[PDB]
Design a protein around this nucleic acid. Structure first.
Ligand SMILES: [Mg+2]
Ligand SMILES: [Mg+2]
Ligand SMILES: [Mg+2]
Ligand SMILES: [Mg+2]
Ligand SMILES: [Mg+2]
Ligand SMILES: [Mg+2]
Ligand SMILES: [Mg+2]
Ligand SMILES: [Mg+2]
Ligand SMILES: [Mg+2]
Ligand SMILES: [Mg+2]
Ligand SMILES: [Mg+2]
Ligand SMILES: [Mg+2]
Ligand SMILES: [Mg+2]
Ligand SMILES: [Mg+2]
Ligand SMILES: [Mg+2]
Ligand SMILES: [Mg+2]
Ligand SMILES: [Mg+2]
Ligand SMILES: [Mg+2]
Ligand SMILES: [Mg+2]
Ligand SMILES: [Mg+2]
Ligand SMILES: [Mg+2]
Ligand SMILES: [Mg+2]
Ligand SMILES: [Mg+2]
Ligand SMILES: [Mg+2]
Ligand SMILES: [Mg+2]
Ligand SMILES: [Mg+2]
Ligand SMILES: [Mg+2]
Ligand SMILES: [Mg+2]
Ligand SMILES: [Mg+2]
Ligand SMILES: [Mg+2]
Ligand SMILES: [Mg+2]
Ligand SMILES: [Mg+2]
Ligand SMILES: [Mg+2]
Ligand SMILES: [Mg+2]
Ligand SMILES: [Mg+2]
Ligand SMILES: [Mg+2]
Ligand SMILES: [Mg+2]
Ligand SMILES: [Mg+2]
Ligand SMILES: [Mg+2]
Ligand SMILES: [Mg+2]
Ligand SMILES: [Mg+2]
Ligand SMILES: [Mg+2]
Ligand SMILES: [Mg+2]
Ligand SMILES: [Mg+2]
Ligand SMILES: [Mg+2]
Ligand SMILES: [Mg+2]
Lengths: 100, 54, 113, 22, 146, 56, 122
RNA sequence: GAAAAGUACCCCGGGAGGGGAGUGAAAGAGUACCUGAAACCGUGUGCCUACAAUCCGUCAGAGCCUCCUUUUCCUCUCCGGAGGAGGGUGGUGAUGGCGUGCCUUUUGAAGAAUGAGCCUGCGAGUCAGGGACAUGUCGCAAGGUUAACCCGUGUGGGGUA
RNA sequence: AUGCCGUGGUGUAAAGCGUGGCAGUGAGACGGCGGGGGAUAAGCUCCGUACGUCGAAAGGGAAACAGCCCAGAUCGCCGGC
RNA sequence: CGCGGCACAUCCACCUUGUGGUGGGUGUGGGUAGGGGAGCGUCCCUCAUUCAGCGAAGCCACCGGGUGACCGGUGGUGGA
């Protein structure tokens, strides 16, 4: 069985025992989270329905807070003398799936 | 005419690698009991003793 | 890996490209089969290269106590030496530069069955 | 003549709405 | 991460398309789609998926009379004034398969993959092909009602 | 202290003709872009000292 | 206080030449050429970090079209019908399903077809 | 190099140069000598490349090679890891999309307008003055302040013009 | 018809006005609408226009394509309209 | 539009309740000439403190870090 779970504005296809990198969640390490789902496949069924799916919630565990890859930015235009350097590191949260 | 641009490393090296020495082939000769190797065109001279093996 | 000996010839008054042309003739060969190749090569740089190869073989046989019939030219290359600069007068008060290049020739022979 | 005519007549497309520079 | 086909995942098959009364454009689109493999959900633009296509009866393709008379084929040899010129009529008389395959090849992407994709196409004027050992399934053209 | 292009030794005349050589225009051999030439806005002997009021 | 420039000046040069590894020709050996190539490269990466979001949607839509037409429905009407049925799965996961679980994709197509209106031209 | 202790002796070589010994803490200090960058030139090696139209990169991406690790196995296992399956570094990049160098100067330059072969070093708003204007800040305040000069080893104390 | 001046209500943060410090600019281009010169020619030329864009604006469309249509890039996302 | 990070200005409440910070809303954040604000790196001097022949500077490689100029750790080479 596997489910399509929504978090951070994006959706992930997960199964029990999977690790996922989602957007940062305001939760420490080791405690439990509950997330809404958009589709549950238990074999042949899909459950395909908001009324039923509003009762199903995947249960997760926070494994820690990692960072994304470092993004180097250097904006440049042809003959102006214009440059603008900028860096970025995205904050994430690693999730272990234990529910469905 | 003058070169408009300097050639890249790859283009210089392609033409430069084709400048090479041709290797001549050597055959065995036994003169005065000793064995040597000379180019095949010098066999007569080697047998008559006109070749100086240094 | 294998027992080996080294010889060098530094500040040899031969252009590095002209030395490499004849070094490519003997790279990888046995010492006996390279000495005669260099003997019969018509190029001028074949003299100094042969001298260095012979010296390396002598070092292997004497200093290392190896067998001459087992020696093979493992690595050989020609690096650049210092370059002297001269002047050739040309037409209409022009003065062009002439480069006298030298080479460093390095040979490593090794004994292997 | 052809170059100018055909350049000027390509403003009559849906994406340009009847106008182009020059 | 979205799925990307690996070397050895692609599975080919053999199709035979009969050109008895199909018009040239319809047949060319169908053949190009089969060759590229766009009908496979495992499609990837940088991978040569898709199948082998055998086209038979290339002389029966439906070409309009005015097209036979007036559609013209141009080749330049590279020499001054070296623009040579045939009609679809003359081509259909002489090398009918070339018309079909030229129409098909015009519809493929213009890159290095299409050079390898076009290697899977076989066009024959007669009703019989030599690839009987391979067992090509017949393929009729469908349109999905919307 | 340093030397300006006016105080560096020599360098009075124009090194060569303005046009027809294919070289840059130079004007003097002691111009600051030359090796061995003058210094632009270089240090000069100064008097660092302030008039702080007696009350302060 | 006379200051030699070398110690401070090489800091940016080392970073440029270190980021320019793998370029062929002068663009990995010479600092002035590597600097221009780095300008171009970082602009390209900025542009592509925003273009790939549409690129992947393009790919997913292509694969969904293939799977839908295999199950005898256009991508067009499949999307209309899924929205009508109130299914909120996104295209990334629809394409993932089409690759992995074709039976589930067929079930989804049945749901979309059922929810689609009886006459689609009214 | 602290000191010449500047490589006796042997070997290849006409020599030059080198190898072995030896001095030295160090020859990764050998009179071409402190450190020893870059351009530039080799040699070896991993991947790619001889049907393809490339501002030379970027995003997607298979496959190889390398080194670490979770599995089922050589359980020889104290072994160590051969291999298998997964994962991760690092190198390479078959293939797909996108993509008109930098500077100056211009209404407008990828421009077939200017400048630049490359690397290294150097190369351009500074200083003077109880100057002028305006501001930030500190001292004193209906007052504020000294100039020359005098006395002090000084950066301190006097000095009302 | 529009535009312009005044006035009373309502709305709108980054409007306006006075006074100082520091400027740059004073070669514009095309497109829409109204005109002069020109042959009611010009990618022509000279004016008007609380008109636009470029200049100094990247992204999408127009095959390519400063000035046309859509739309103004704070960074990230393998989300959606 | 969604979810996350940053910054400017302003409104609403506290801590010195604008020297400046703390919490939440709201608006804003393309840019040439040009104006304003805040910073990085190099060298020299003074004061305090701390490393260095058990190895400083400089240079090289690798692994990391910051919104930027840039920084750190480890190893190698080196010798004040
Ligand atoms: Mg400009
Ligand atoms: Mg003369
Ligand atoms: Mg003078
Ligand atoms: Mg003069
Ligand atoms: Mg001098
Ligand atoms: Mg001087
Ligand atoms: Mg006094
Ligand atoms: Mg590469
Ligand atoms: Mg988008
Ligand atoms: Mg000793
Ligand atoms: Mg030492
Ligand atoms: Mg030393
Ligand atoms: Mg030297
Ligand atoms: Mg040295
Ligand atoms: Mg090939
Ligand atoms: Mg082309
Ligand atoms: Mg490419
Ligand atoms: Mg293109
Ligand atoms: Mg002009
Ligand atoms: Mg040019
Ligand atoms: Mg050009
Ligand atoms: Mg021009
Ligand atoms: Mg010119
Ligand atoms: Mg000019
Ligand atoms: Mg030039
Ligand atoms: Mg000053
Ligand atoms: Mg004051
Ligand atoms: Mg003002
Ligand atoms: Mg004027
Ligand atoms: Mg004017
Ligand atoms: Mg008009
Ligand atoms: Mg007129
Ligand atoms: Mg005009
Ligand atoms: Mg004009
Ligand atoms: Mg106008
Ligand atoms: Mg301008
Ligand atoms: Mg634009
Ligand atoms: Mg504007
Ligand atoms: Mg555009
Ligand atoms: Mg904006
Ligand atoms: Mg801005
Ligand atoms: Mg500016
Ligand atoms: Mg010691
Ligand atoms: Mg120092
Ligand atoms: Mg260190
Ligand atoms: Mg060190």
């Amino acid at each position: 069985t596997y489910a399509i779970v929504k978090t951070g504005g994006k959706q992930y296809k997960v199964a029990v025992g999977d690790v996922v990198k989602v957007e940062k969640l305001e939760s420490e390490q080791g405690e439990k989270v509950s997330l809404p789902v958009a589709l549950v496949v238990d074999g042949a069924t899909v459950t395909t329905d908001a009324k039923a799916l509003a009762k199903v919630a995947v249960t997760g565990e926070v494994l820690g807070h990692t960072k994304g890859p470092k993004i180097r930015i250097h904006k440049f235009k042809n003959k102006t003398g214009y440059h603008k350097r900028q860096g970025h590191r995205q904050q994430l949260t690693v999730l272990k799936v234990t529910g469905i | 005419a003058v070169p408009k641009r300097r050639k890249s490393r790859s283009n210089t090296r392609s033409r430069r690698s084709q400048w090479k020495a041709a290797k001549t082939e050597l055959v065995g000769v036994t003169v005065a009991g000793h064995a040597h190797k000379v180019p095949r065109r010098l066999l007569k001279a080697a047998r008559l003793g006109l070749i100086d093996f240094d | 890996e294998y027992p080996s000996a080294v010889a060098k010839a530094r500040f040899v008054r031969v252009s590095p490209r002209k030395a490499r042309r004849v070094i490519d003739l003997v790279r990888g060969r046995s010492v006996s089969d390279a000495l005669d190749i260099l003997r019969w090569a018509p190029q001028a740089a074949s003299g100094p290269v042969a001298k260095v190869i012979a010296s390396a073989a002598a070092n292997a046989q004497n200093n290392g106590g190896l067998d001459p019939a087992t020696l093979v030219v493992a690595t050989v290359y020609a690096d650049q030496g210092p370059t002297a600069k001269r002047i050739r007068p040309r037409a209409q008060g022009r003065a062009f530069r002439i480069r006298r290049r030298t080479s460093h020739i390095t040979v490593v022979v090794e004994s292997r069955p | 003549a052809k170059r100018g005519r055909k350049k000027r007549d390509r403003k009559y497309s849906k994406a340009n709405h009847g106008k182009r520079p020059n | 991460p979205t799925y990307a086909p690996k070397a050895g995942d692609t599975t080919r098959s053999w199709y035979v398309i009969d050109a008895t009364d199909v018009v040239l454009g319809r047949l060319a689109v169908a053949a190009a789609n089969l060759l590229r493999g766009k009908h496979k959900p495992t499609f990837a633009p940088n991978v040569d998926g898709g199948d082998f296509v055998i086209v038979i009866n290339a002389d029966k393709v439906a070409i309009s009379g005015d097209k036979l008379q007036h559609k013209m084929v141009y080749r330049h040899s590279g020499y001054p004034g070296g623009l040579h010129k045939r009609t679809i009529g003359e081509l259909m008389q002489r090398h009918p398969d070339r018309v079909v395959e030229k129409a098909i090849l015009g519809m493929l992407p213009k890159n290095r993959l299409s050079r390898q994709i076009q290697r899977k196409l076989r066009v024959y004027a007669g009703p019989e092909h030599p690839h009987s050992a391979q067992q090509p399934v017949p393929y009729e053209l469908k349109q999905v009602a919307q | 202290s340093t030397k300006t292009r006016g105080e560096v030794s020599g360098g009075g005349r124009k090194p060569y003709r303005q046009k027809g050589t294919g070289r840059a225009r130079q004007g003097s051999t002691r111009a600051p872009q030359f090796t061995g030439g003058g210094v632009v806005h270089g240090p000069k002997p100064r008097d660092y000292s302030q008039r702080t009021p007696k009350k302060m | 206080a006379r200051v030699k420039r070398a110690v401070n000046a090489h800091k940016k040069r080392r970073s440029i030449l270190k980021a320019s590894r793998g370029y062929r020709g002068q663009r990995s050996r010479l600092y002035r050429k590597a600097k221009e190539q780095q300008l171009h490269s970082l602009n390209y990466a900025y542009r592509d970090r925003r273009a790939r979001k549409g690129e992947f949607r393009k790919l997913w839509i292509a694969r969904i079209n293939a799977a839908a037409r295999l199950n005898d429905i256009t991508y067009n009407r499949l999307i209309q019908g899924l929205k009508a049925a109130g299914v909120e799965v996104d295209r990334k996961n629809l394409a993932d399903i089409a690759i992995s679980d074709p039976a589930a994709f067929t079930a989804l197509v049945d749901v979309a077809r059922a929810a689609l209106p009886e006459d689609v031209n009214a």
